[PDB]
Design an enzyme around this catalytic site. Structure first.
Site, PDB file in Angstrom:
ATOM      1  N   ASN B  10       0.908  -1.145   0.000  1.00 15.28           N
ATOM      2  CA  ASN B  10       0.000   0.000   0.000  1.00 15.28           C
ATOM      3  C   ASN B  10       0.932   1.175   0.000  1.00 15.28           C
ATOM      4  O   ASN B  10       1.588   1.456   1.008  1.00 15.28           O
ATOM      5  CB  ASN B  10      -0.868   0.059   1.296  1.00 15.28           C
ATOM      6  CG  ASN B  10      -1.646   1.331   1.411  1.00 15.28           C
ATOM      7  OD1 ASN B  10      -1.689   2.092   0.420  1.00 15.28           O
ATOM      8  ND2 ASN B  10      -2.317   1.547   2.546  1.00 15.28           N
ATOM      9  N   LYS B  12       0.261   4.109  -0.473  1.00 14.06           N
ATOM     10  CA  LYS B  12      -0.392   5.292   0.050  1.00 14.06           C
ATOM     11  C   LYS B  12      -0.114   6.448  -0.875  1.00 14.06           C
ATOM     12  O   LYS B  12      -0.002   6.212  -2.069  1.00 14.06           O
ATOM     13  CB  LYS B  12      -0.076   5.633   1.505  1.00 14.06           C
ATOM     14  CG  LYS B  12      -0.040   4.396   2.407  1.00 14.06           C
ATOM     15  CD  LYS B  12       0.180   4.700   3.883  1.00 14.06           C
ATOM     16  CE  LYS B  12       0.178   3.457   4.772  1.00 14.06           C
ATOM     17  NZ  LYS B  12      -0.294   3.776   6.121  1.00 14.06           N
ATOM     18  N   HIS B  94      -9.554   2.085   4.944  1.00 10.03           N
ATOM     19  CA  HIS B  94      -8.255   2.217   5.566  1.00 10.03           C
ATOM     20  C   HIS B  94      -8.377   3.173   6.749  1.00 10.03           C
ATOM     21  O   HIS B  94      -9.144   4.156   6.694  1.00 10.03           O
ATOM     22  CB  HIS B  94      -7.245   2.793   4.553  1.00 10.03           C
ATOM     23  CG  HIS B  94      -5.853   2.641   5.055  1.00 10.03           C
ATOM     24  ND1 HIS B  94      -5.290   3.560   5.921  1.00 10.03           N
ATOM     25  CD2 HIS B  94      -4.988   1.603   4.906  1.00 10.03           C
ATOM     26  CE1 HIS B  94      -4.145   3.027   6.334  1.00 10.03           C
ATOM     27  NE2 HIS B  94      -3.924   1.867   5.714  1.00 10.03           N
ATOM     28  N   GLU B  96      -6.726   5.587   7.753  1.00 13.87           N
ATOM     29  CA  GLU B  96      -6.517   6.952   7.394  1.00 13.87           C
ATOM     30  C   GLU B  96      -7.751   7.635   6.855  1.00 13.87           C
ATOM     31  O   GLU B  96      -7.984   8.794   7.179  1.00 13.87           O
ATOM     32  CB  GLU B  96      -5.255   7.124   6.547  1.00 13.87           C
ATOM     33  CG  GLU B  96      -4.017   6.584   7.310  1.00 13.87           C
ATOM     34  CD  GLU B  96      -2.914   6.034   6.422  1.00 13.87           C
ATOM     35  OE1 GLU B  96      -2.960   6.007   5.197  1.00 13.87           O
ATOM     36  OE2 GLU B  96      -1.881   5.631   7.117  1.00 13.87           O
ATOM     37  N   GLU B 166      -5.710  -4.074  11.066  1.00 14.21           N
ATOM     38  CA  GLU B 166      -4.609  -3.158  11.176  1.00 14.21           C
ATOM     39  C   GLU B 166      -4.821  -2.254  12.369  1.00 14.21           C
ATOM     40  O   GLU B 166      -5.529  -1.267  12.279  1.00 14.21           O
ATOM     41  CB  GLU B 166      -4.388  -2.416   9.807  1.00 14.21           C
ATOM     42  CG  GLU B 166      -5.666  -1.794   9.169  1.00 14.21           C
ATOM     43  CD  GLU B 166      -5.469  -0.421   8.531  1.00 14.21           C
ATOM     44  OE1 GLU B 166      -4.379   0.087   8.335  1.00 14.21           O
ATOM     45  OE2 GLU B 166      -6.578   0.180   8.157  1.00 14.21           O
ATOM     46  N   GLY B 172       2.532   2.682  11.061  1.00 15.60           N
ATOM     47  CA  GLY B 172       3.735   3.459  10.823  1.00 15.60           C
ATOM     48  C   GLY B 172       4.355   4.078  12.078  1.00 15.60           C
ATOM     49  O   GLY B 172       4.796   5.228  12.066  1.00 15.60           O
ATOM     50  N   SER B 212       3.383  -1.743  10.792  1.00 11.68           N
ATOM     51  CA  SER B 212       4.818  -1.766  11.040  1.00 11.68           C
ATOM     52  C   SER B 212       5.460  -3.131  10.764  1.00 11.68           C
ATOM     53  O   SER B 212       6.395  -3.540  11.440  1.00 11.68           O
ATOM     54  CB  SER B 212       5.139  -1.171  12.401  1.00 11.68           C
ATOM     55  OG  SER B 212       4.530   0.122  12.487  1.00 11.68           O
TER      56      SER B 212
HETATM   57  O1  LIG Z   1      -1.254   0.236   4.974  1.00 13.19           O
HETATM   58  C1  LIG Z   1      -0.886   0.578   6.130  1.00 13.19           C
HETATM   59  O2  LIG Z   1      -1.622   1.211   6.945  1.00 13.19           O
HETATM   60  C2  LIG Z   1       0.492   0.071   6.604  1.00 13.19           C
HETATM   61  C3  LIG Z   1       0.184  -1.329   7.114  1.00 13.19           C
HETATM   62  O3  LIG Z   1      -1.232  -1.548   7.181  1.00 13.19           O
HETATM   63  O4  LIG Z   1       1.144   0.931   7.582  1.00 13.19           O
HETATM   64  P1  LIG Z   1       2.775   0.829   7.921  1.00 13.19           P
HETATM   65  O5  LIG Z   1       3.491   1.971   7.205  1.00 13.19           O
HETATM   66  O6  LIG Z   1       2.932   0.973   9.435  1.00 13.19           O
HETATM   67  O7  LIG Z   1       3.228  -0.517   7.350  1.00 13.19           O
END
Ligand SMILES: O=C(O)[C@H](CO)OP(=O)(O)O
Lengths: 249, 249
Positions: B10, B12, B94, B96, B166, B172, B212
């Site tokens: 991902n 992001k 997600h 976020e 998650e 992160g 993480s």
């Molecule tokens: O997609 C995310 O939210 C990832 C793992 O789910 O976060 P991280 O950067 O901590 O791997």
């Protein structure tokens, strides 16, 4: 006497490779003799295809939104990302984003500030709702919207800014904006700028009309003193946008 | 005896054409001899680049978000648009988006349902915040979440769902769940699934860990019964993701 006009196409959340490729062709074939900046704002997914397929010298491409920095913002796209990809125009603070996506005056102003900072040309949308209108708050709302943006910019910054006034009171409500009403609102924004920022800035500023425009009323709207162009919705996914470009003559 | 794992990248809201290009070259170069479905979820903007450059047969591309229908939603991308572009996987709910962009359980459920209807493979995210974990509310939170989703689905639909667990506090931060914390959450999810939907369904469902995860810790996490793979954020931007891939089966 007006600054260079802008005819902006806001495709919104529409399109297919097919239908778009066709429109693009229509566009490319378009014969435009005046000084006009044409802008096509497609979905993020379609940026690459639009980049590659738009050849017309009077058209640039824009994104429909962005976030200031890259990082952990799943599903969002940042200014640096659009910059590396070669997009330099951007629509910000669209009424739909304010209505459905949490975009407050402040969030918009932050976005505008980052974008300007980063080199973009920004089309920043403002405009009042039916309710705000009905209760005699047009002025209060619009000026507050413009002020929040202003506080974040320096004078020099204004050269990268376009304002698009949206009559939200007239989108989906049953109401009709006349050219007169469009113009009142436009004049009011210009006055604010002229007054708070400068006459120079004000004379150079493009204020686009972001209401209901089609090929049959775009000339009469353009006839108005403070109209510099349009931010187009529906008619933008159509051939008629070509009439809209012509109306900015 | 475990269903086919998934190692999902991902990315992001990050990246450049060049940096992603490198990753892709690395990926394509990788020999993956076990049964694993690799997933690369990039920005909307980079989908073209990705779909054109990713050649490895074990990798699919996914979008990181979407809205259900096409229309007047400036800045958003719809499922139809995605589907038209040839994207069949998608990451929904997600942390976020729930945290920052107003995505409720209801909103996530709706999105998931729509995606399953439009034929996508969905990675539906669920997880509890630090606050919730400390209060001893983990079980309520997780099950509420999984329940909201389940409401909108029919049994058949589940074949297209993947559940990503998650824990918000591990996103992160460097704060990975211990293999016990992970395995307890995953087991709890599965036991809900069997009870409510069916044992057959449950034994098939892929439940991923996200938070993480890195090259070093991934092997142990994977050893856990109810752990079918990973949703990887930060390490998906490095070659280390490869070690992650290798950690599954
Ligand atoms: O997609 C995310 O939210 C990832 C793992 O789910 O976060 P991280 O950067 O901590 O791997």
């Amino acid at each position: 006497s007006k600054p260079q006009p802008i005819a902006a196409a806001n495709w919104k959340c529409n399109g297919s490779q097919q239908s778009l490729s066709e429109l693009i062709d229509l566009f490319n074939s378009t014969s435009i003799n005046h000084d006009v900046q044409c802008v096509v704002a497609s979905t993020f997914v379609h940026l690459a295809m639009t980049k590659e397929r738009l050849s017309h010298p009077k058209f640039v491409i824009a994104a429909q939104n962005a976030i200031a920095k890259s990082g952990a913002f799943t599903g969002e796209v940042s200014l640096p990302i659009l910059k590396d990809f070669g997009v330099n125009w951007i629509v910000l603070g669209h009424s739909e984003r304010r209505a459905y996506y949490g975009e407050t005056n402040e969030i918009v102003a932050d976005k505008v500030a980052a974008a300007v900072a980063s080199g973009f040309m920004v089309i920043a949308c403002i405009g009042e709702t039916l309710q705000e209108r009905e209760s005699g708050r047009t002025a209060v709302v619009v000026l507050t919207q413009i002020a929040a943006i202003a506080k974040k910019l320096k004078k020099a910054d204004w050269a990268k800014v376009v304002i698009a006034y949206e009559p939200v009171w007239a989108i989906g409500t049953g109401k009709v904006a006349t050219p007169q009403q469009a113009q009142e609102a436009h004049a009011l924004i210009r006055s604010w700028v002229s007054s708070k920022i400068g006459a120079d800035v004000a004379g150079e500023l493009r204020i686009l009309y972001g209401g209901s425009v089609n090929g049959k009323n775009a000339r009469t709207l353009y006839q108005q003193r403070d109209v510099n162009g349009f931010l187009v919705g529906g008619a933008s996914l159509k051939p008629e946008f070509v009439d809209i470009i012509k109306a900015t003559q």
